[PDB]
Amino acid sequence: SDLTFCEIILMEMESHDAAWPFLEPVNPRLVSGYRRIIKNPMDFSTMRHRLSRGGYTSSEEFAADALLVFDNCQTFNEDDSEVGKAGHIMRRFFESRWEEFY
Numbered sequence: 001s002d003l004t005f006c007e008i009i010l011m012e013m014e015s016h017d018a019a020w021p022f023l024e025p026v027n028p029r030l031v032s033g034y035r036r037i038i039k040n041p042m043d044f045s046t047m048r049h050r051l052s053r054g055g056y057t058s059s060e061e062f063a064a065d066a067l068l069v070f071d072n073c074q075t076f077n078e079d080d081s082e083v084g085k086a087g088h089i090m091r092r093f094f095e096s097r098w099e100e101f102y
């Protein structure tokens, strides 16, 4: 019953104005040397793939992947960059919705 809310939250994040950096895996042709720094990439497409296939055994596991998206953003980008700002917006949005649903 808790896992059904993850799809709803995922859809809301996919639709958010600030979500553009996170929709698909980082493209290494666009973001030079990404994997030198980010050893465990994550993105909303990968999360959708796993959620749709029972790859999350609990809502907590889904939340951990959401936070990994934002933690990787914060590790790679300065807070005042456009992508860094987007990550902070999305983390706040995610955490707020998580509290409402749970």
Ligand SMILES: CN(C)CCCOc1ccc(-c2cc(NCCCn3cccn3)nc(S(C)(=O)=O)n2)cc1
Pocket: 020, 021, 022, 026, 030, 031, 072, 073, 074, 076, 077, 083, 087
């Ligand atoms: C072809 N299709 C329309 C592309 C649409 C999506 O394009 C993206 C998506 C995500 C990025 C990107 C970048 C970045 N740090 C660098 C910021 C400076 N920058 C370098 C290249 C571009 N901007 N960090 C991150 S993340 C996920 O670690 O926070 N994600 C980039 C492009």
